[PDB]
Amino acid sequence: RHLKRELKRAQEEVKRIQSVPLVIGQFLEPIDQNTGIVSSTTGMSYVVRILSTLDRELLKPSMSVALHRHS
């Protein structure tokens, strides 16, 4: 029961990061399935962590995607 209460808190953490402020990128291609490539709309390329509990089947083809702006 303790570990379940800390998960709800673990996710709560990351949801603060999920919500705005954000910047909008575009997914080019994966490089693993836990790392991906995006070109941000500042026209800069980042290799980035793929967050878990997300899409991976419309993500891998080219599609919009939300990235954090300070992380």
Added chain:
Amino acid sequence: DKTENDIKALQSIGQLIGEVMKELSEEKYIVKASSGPRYIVGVRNSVDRSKLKKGVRVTLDITTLTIMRILPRETDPLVYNMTSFEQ
């Protein structure tokens, strides 16, 4: 009072203009900024959903990036020079 008004502007900060490019979700809006790059940004309860439509200019903060108010449209500095010809 002439200097009190300057204090009140000074301890405030500027706004950075966008426009609603596309609605995403209740509290999340996609804007395309007048400076360029698109963001996802939030809303206060200082604006309504029935008070926003697309191509309507919105304010953002430059320290949290959240909409507080509806902004009238913009129009070129250039086209104001043409209305000043009439001679």
